[PDB]
Ligand binder design. Structure first.
Ligand SMILES: [Co+2]
Ligand SMILES: [Co+2]
Ligand SMILES: [Fe+2]
Ligand SMILES: [Fe+2]
Lengths: 293, 297
């Protein structure tokens, strides 16, 4: 029921321990095509493989990679790492923009954009048989611009036609997440199929709860990126939200400084502060299972 | 020994010949095409590329300047794959086509870092091919001159000083963006006659077109066939008005071709029209030969 990169599908029950938001590799499609002398596919590949290998050491079974248009999605690269590690990797479709769309989308309808997403879900991605397993959309400081709203509505339509869930990028300080959730549910999207991301960058604990209360997963997913909020402020927001019994809605990731910083810092901090392996299992196993259920 | 070419060796800026200064063999969004290749068809775009190039050589075009850059799908492998089938003098370029923001890769990065990336295309080559870049292409439009748009403008000027190359721009004829690019590049001390300000033929406000021409810069009447911005006869009215008002030395004409829109509509219409309205053969040589020669000298 969940498509995978270079494997057969899996039942949502078998997803296992999951990191819900990690980037194997991410870049601007335009910058790379026009100046490859700034990149190297040799170092990029090895670091992907070894980081994943470590992640499999610590017990990570499944990785969800929300690299889409605007972030350099390459399914050929993804089927490489799957070959070299055997990891369960979920790829998605969608559009990552903050203001306007590429000039190609001038005079194109929302149903024209959803077709692209529905194409990646039903037929495959970039020619390969790898199919999308979720849609990814984004909003930030500019808030909900009109092209950003076109993208949100194109995701709601793909969700209703394929029932794959939606991951969002948002800005924690300007209400974009709540607006994403408001527009998506209005269009019929089940709240439980929505992950509002990048809420770790805030401490307005009542804003986070307002999103969780409406039935969507909340993203505490920017560890290691210590330029937004220090980790030991993130770990207290997480713990606070866990002490209030919100672990059924909490989702934690790195947004990738390494892809094991949670096993080194986050999880050990939490287990020292009370949370049993039930809470840890709710966040990294059961919540991903409902999200793809 | 001056103007690099795609699939060929360098020529002097006075062997340039009959130039179409602004044409696109192909244009697309790198981000859209990399993600949804089922939308495109390289083979059809190869046949149409070659068809229209050689048919422009039938009418005597010797050189086509192509300002397809970052944001417009520049691909020198496709370019020299068309040169091999036509023998055209193709001038590739470097630069950044944006209207609001730069890609996130450029976040916190510096004006000189961007300029270093144009100079890599000019001095070392483009996309790891031995094809170099003969000019810098920058852009502005309806969003106005914004912060990152202004950083690419100045990044271009810095490539002008070091490399010498001229600078083709894309503006919006209806909001003084073209003038502001000139106001910014020259206030940065670039040779005004090394700036071609583009798409001025989209308006019939002659006074605005002349103010840019008077300040020393080439004006671009370069979207022939695109009737959504201005119909053809209304463009022939403006081009003629500008010729008979003295400005033939700072006029450049092209199609910007990526109704009756092709890459030879000026030979099928505009040039017969101008001849029968008092334009002799030496002024059309000024427009398609002399003005290019100077731009690249
Ligand atoms: Co993100
Ligand atoms: Co243009
Ligand atoms: Fe991300
Ligand atoms: Fe153009």
């Amino acid at each position: 029921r969940i498509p995978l990169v270079g494997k057969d599908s899996i039942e949502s029950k078998d997803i296992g321990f999951t990191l819900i938001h990690e980037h194997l590799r991410a870049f601007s499609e335009a910058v790379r095509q026009q100046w490859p002398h700034l990149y190297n596919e040799d170092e990029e590949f090895r670091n992907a493989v070894n980081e994943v290998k470590r992640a499999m050491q610590f017990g990570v079974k499944t990785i969800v990679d929300p690299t889409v248009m605007g972030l350099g999605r390459d399914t050929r690269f993804m089927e490489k790492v799957v070959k070299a590690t055997g990891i369960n990797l979920v790829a998605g479709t969608g559009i990552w923009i903050f203001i306007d769309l590429p000039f190609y989308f001038l005079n194109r309808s929302i149903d024209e954009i959803a077709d692209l997403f529905i194409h990646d879900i039903k037929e495959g991605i970039q020619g390969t048989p790898n199919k999308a397993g979720f849609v990814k959309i984004a909003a930030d400081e500019p808030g909900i611009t009109k092209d950003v709203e076109k993208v949100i509505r194109a995701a709601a339509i793909a969700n209703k036609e394929t029932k794959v869930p939606i991951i969002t990028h948002s800005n924690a300080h300007n209400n974009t997440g709540l607006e994403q959730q408001r527009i998506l549910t209005e269009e019929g999207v089940d709240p439980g199929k929505i992950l509002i991301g990048h809420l770790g960058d805030t401490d307005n604990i009542d804003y986070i709860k307002k999103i969780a209360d409406k039935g969507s997963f909340i993203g505490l997913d920017r560890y290691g990126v210590d330029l937004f909020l220090p980790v030991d402020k993130r770990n207290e927001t997480t713990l606070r939200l866990i002490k209030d019994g919100y672990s059924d809605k909490i989702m934690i990731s790195h947004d990738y400084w390494s892809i094991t910083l949670i096993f080194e810092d986050t999880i050990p901090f939490l287990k020292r502060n009370g949370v049993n392996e039930e809470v840890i299992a709710t966040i990294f196993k059961e919540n991903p299972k409902k999200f793809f259920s």
